């Protein structure tokens, strides 16, 4: 029961600002991921243990980036692409979003093994990056797109088409939002925060130049991940809470939190642009490889 809260959208905030951010992200991400893929593929020396992880992440980021023009077009006027693409777009978006966050957890495990256990851990890293990546990144991501195939389809009203996941009752929405947060933030967050913290606990007291240089980069990575992915999930959580009626603060509160989610999801989309800078172009070895591949 109770009254009904209907969404309200600003013309400018939905028509002029979001398309510009989407376009900027599209261009920057496609350029960065393209450069990383060409550098990784055109090198001839070998494929180091961490040169096999940059490629997975670049592929996932490229798949995510390809989705952006469709969302920009939808936000501008409406959906023109039919019913099949209203499923294909969601499938691609979900796969890329989940894989691009699980790959970070695997990279963190690789680094923790390669630093803390340096003398003896030469076999497990190879086993991980050659066999377990497919089991632990791509298989769950693919298996989590069944709801996209099932519950996503375009619907017609007047002369405007909307592409959205249509669910029968509120509970499906809450179940899938809780699954989304649990798989996208909690599972990789604890792994990253538990490995990098015990790395910087060991790289701190040394007076060498290289260790002091690597400490800053690790701290930058830890802060960047959470500062990019936290506000969106806070908004998702406080929306799922009000869908359960455990938060009752009127309707203007709901409109405000929806505006916050809409404005911060675009901010969270910058992961596909911040990943190549943080994981590829901040390394001396990769810089040398890129300079070699230029010629």
């Amino acid at each position: 029961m109770k009254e009904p809260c209907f969404r309200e959208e600003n013309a400018n905030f939905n028509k002029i600002f979001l398309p510009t951010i989407y376009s900027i992200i599209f261009l920057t991400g496609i350029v960065g991921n393209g450069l990383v893929i060409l550098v990784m593929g055109y090198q001839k020396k070998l494929r180091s243990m961490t040169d096999k992880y940059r490629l997975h992440l670049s592929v996932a980021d490229l798949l995510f980036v390809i989705t952006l023009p469709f969302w920009a077009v939808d936000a501008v006027a409406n959906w023109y692409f039919g019913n099949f693409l209203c499923k294909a777009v969601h499938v691609i978006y979900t796969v890329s979003l989940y894989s691009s966050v699980l790959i970070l957890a695997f990279i963190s495990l690789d680094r923790y093994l390669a630093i803390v256990h340096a003398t003896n851990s030469q076999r497990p890293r190879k086993l991980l990056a050659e066999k377990v990546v497919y089991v632990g990144v791509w298989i769950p991501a693919l298996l989590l797109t069944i709801p996209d195939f099932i519950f996503a389809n375009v619907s017609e009203a007047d002369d405007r088409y909307i592409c959205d996941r249509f669910y029968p009752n509120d509970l499906w929405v809450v179940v899938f939002q809780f699954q989304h947060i649990m798989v996208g933030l909690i599972l990789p967050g604890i792994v990253i925060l538990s490995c990098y913290c015990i790395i910087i606990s060991k790289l701190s007291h040394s007076k060498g130049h290289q260790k002091r240089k690597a400490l800053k980069t690790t701290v930058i990575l830890i802060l960047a991940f959470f500062a990019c992915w936290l506000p969106y999930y806070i908004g998702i959580s406080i929306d799922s809470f009000i869908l359960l009626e455990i938060i009752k603060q009127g309707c203007e509160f709901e409109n405000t939190v929806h505006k916050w989610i809409s404005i911060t999801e675009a901010l969270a989309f910058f992961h596909c642009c911040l990943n190549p800078i943080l994981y590829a172009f901040l390394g001396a070895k990769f810089k040398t490889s890129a300079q070699h591949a230029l010629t």
Partner: antibody
Framework: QVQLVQSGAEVKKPGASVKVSCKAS????????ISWVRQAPGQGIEWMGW????????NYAQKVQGRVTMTTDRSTSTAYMDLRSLRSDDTAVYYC???????????????????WGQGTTVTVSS | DVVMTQSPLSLPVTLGQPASISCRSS???????????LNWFQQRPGQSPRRLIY???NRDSGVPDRFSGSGSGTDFTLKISRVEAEDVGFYYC?????????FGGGTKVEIKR
């Protein structure tokens, strides 16, 4: 096809209660809402409510507030409209029309009343 | 809410001559995103109201091109180019931008003789 079918004509006594049904078909039921509209004989059309057919968020007209209740049956794909404490003024013809759009994230009410079921006649006399 | 009045209350017509029904709203029928959700209905006697045009100008499929709409702001109308025997019945205009929605008074289109 996208059509809406309603109940039959019925005669009642003052102070009684009535219920009419609007069985929809031909379209995905759980993506739109149903609005109930009446038209008194020789007087303008007027609105008395809305219902969601998805998490049941109903709203009622100010005048008919507290005298009418609406429920939907998602399993059988139909909507009801319960009215009680009838006067002689209630003699009219009640209509049923699809109204609004719903979804996980998109949820509006500015989408027009298109299907417009055939409507039933209701009379009250002693 | 928003009260809409439309005139004339009655309007006799001779065949082949235009007819004009006009309704103007109490407030400005513009939403935050723009557009103007006002639509016109025709109710031939012994039937249910049937949509003719929506959003002030667009016409839904299956309606004869004779009906046309124009105008904007808080003053606009509906006009029929050519009238035959199948244009007799009440006409209403409804706005759906504010909560709730409201219906016009209704104009009977009689046939002149």
């Amino acid at each position: 096809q996208v059509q809406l079918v309603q109940s039959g004509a019925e005669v009642k006594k003052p102070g009684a209660s009535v219920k009419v049904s609007c069985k929809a078909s031909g379209y995905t039921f759980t993506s739109y809402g149903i609005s109930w509209v009446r038209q008194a004989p020789g007087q303008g059309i007027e609105w008395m409510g809305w219902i969601s057919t998805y998490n049941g968020n109903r709203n009622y007209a100010q005048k008919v507030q507290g005298r009418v209740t609406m429920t939907t049956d998602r399993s059988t794909s139909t909507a009801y409209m319960d009215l009680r404490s009838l006067r002689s003024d209630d003699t009219a013809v009640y209509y049923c029309a699809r109204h609004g759009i719903t979804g996980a994230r998109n949820y509006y009410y500015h989408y027009g009343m298109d299907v417009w079921g055939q409507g039933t006649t209701v009379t009250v006399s002693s | 809410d928003v009260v809409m009045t439309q005139s004339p209350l009655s309007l006799p017509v001779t065949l082949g001559q235009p007819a004009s029904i006009s309704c103007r709203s109490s407030q400005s029928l513009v939403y935050t995103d723009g557009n103007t959700y006002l639509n016109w209905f025709q109710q031939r006697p012994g039937q249910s109201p049937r949509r003719l045009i929506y959003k002030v100008s667009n016409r839904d499929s299956g309606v004869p091109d004779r009906f046309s709409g124009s105008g904007s702001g808080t003053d606009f109308t509906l006009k029929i180019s050519r009238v035959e025997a199948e244009d007799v019945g009440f006409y209403y205009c409804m706005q759906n931008t504010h909560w709730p929605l409201t219906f016009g008074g209704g104009t009977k289109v009689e046939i002149k003789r």
